[PDB]
Amino acid sequence: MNFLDQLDLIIQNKHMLEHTFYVKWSKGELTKEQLQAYAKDYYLHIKAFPKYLSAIHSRCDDLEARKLLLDNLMDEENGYPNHIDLWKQFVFALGVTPEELEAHEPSEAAKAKVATFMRWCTGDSLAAGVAALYSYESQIPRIAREKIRGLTEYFGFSNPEDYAYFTEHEEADVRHAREEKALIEMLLKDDADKVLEASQEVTQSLYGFLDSFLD
Amino acid sequence: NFLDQLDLIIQNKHMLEHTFYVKWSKGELTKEQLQAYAKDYYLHIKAFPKYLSAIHSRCDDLEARKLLLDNLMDEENGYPNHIDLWKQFVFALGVTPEELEAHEPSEAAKAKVATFMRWCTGDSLAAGVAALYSYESQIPRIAREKIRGLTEYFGFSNPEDYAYFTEHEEADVRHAREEKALIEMLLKDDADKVLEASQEVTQSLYGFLDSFL
């Protein structure tokens, strides 16, 4: 299981928080226009994430593994407000109207990112599917903390219900990463090489997505 | 309207008119036939959450996904879930957990599950739901009959032994209603595939029940 350490090293060496977009974020050096383009363009992935999870679940005969995947899917989509609801709240807190959001056309970078996730989640390796999701979710707790700080320090976010997306979990997200790590081991079928390849593609794809909001 | 034709396909090839359940409702099944049925059904019971997630994973209608997730949660979330409750019914028939695990699904069982998965992973969301509806819309009536047969002929006096049929079928009425709404929500001028799915599902179920005679 040293491939799990290789997996974490890939992610550490290509981590979203070292991307220029989030370095600028941490300094307040982002325009309203930039934050608005980012929140709108991210919606596609936010809406797709439940499908990444059900994609893997639908191909899985490990009953305990399915329960862990279902747990995450419920966290994402069950109830009101769900994750998609909370993301919309953050979009509207930035000045985008409900109709600007629904009218937005996802960029090519956003579509390529979502396609990278779905390719792994519908592929022939369950472990590599989970590894694709882990390569994203394992970054989220740290990102959420930094994003919350920038939002209150530089971008004028006083009403804490306005960044509830980054808050109402930031804990569930720690749990998701831990359970995904265990899922990778439960579902491994001599395909550690695919686990690592999924991580490389996902981390690069996330960088390409963040690249699109800089000049 | 294709929904009425759909309901007529199901009414006219209904599991409760199959010889197996005809014999069930008279007590004319042996303890050995029951145990074979209960063990062979386990493949389908375990697979059912995957039918729902397969459709969900191909769906961008956010409201439709929530209804599919509701059914999936009903099936698999919590303890005891549906699968645990089926095991309870199996073991109440005299089968050991070792025998249940060791059981190899028949070809008729595998064929029935492959029919469901063929539609749920296919290119028509509405026809995937219609395949599930062609089964689930039958279950409230079937659950009622089976409960009668179990208590009246096969010695079930502890209601916990047939909890699979009770603690949910009441939710299965809701599932059929919601799946009928889902078929409409997701229709993409593929009513013909909706009907094709129902023909295959109703017949696959007859083939499955055929195998116990």
From Swiss-Prot, chain A:
- Which InterPro entries does the record associate with it? Fol-rel_CADD, Haem_Oase-like_multi-hlx, PqqC-like, Thiaminase-2/PQQC
Cofactor(s) the protein needs: Fe(2+); Mn(2+)
Q: What Gene3D superfamilies does this protein's entry cite?
A: Heme oxygenase-like
What is its EC class?
oxidoreductase
> One Pfam match, by short name?
TENA_THI-4
User: Its GO CC terms?
Assistant: extracellular region; host cell cytoplasm
- Site (Side-chain cleavage) found at 22
Q: Which family does it belong to?
A: Belongs to the CADD family.
Q: What is this protein called?
A: 4-aminobenzoate synthase
Any other comment in the entry? Answer: Can complement the PABA-auxotrophic E.coli mutant lacking pabA, pabB and pabC genes.
Q: What PANTHER family does UniProt report for this protein, alphabetically?
A: 4-AMINOBENZOATE SYNTHASE, PQQC-LIKE PROTEIN
* Organism listed in the record: Chlamydia trachomatis serovar D (strain ATCC VR-885 / DSM 19411 / UW-3/Cx)
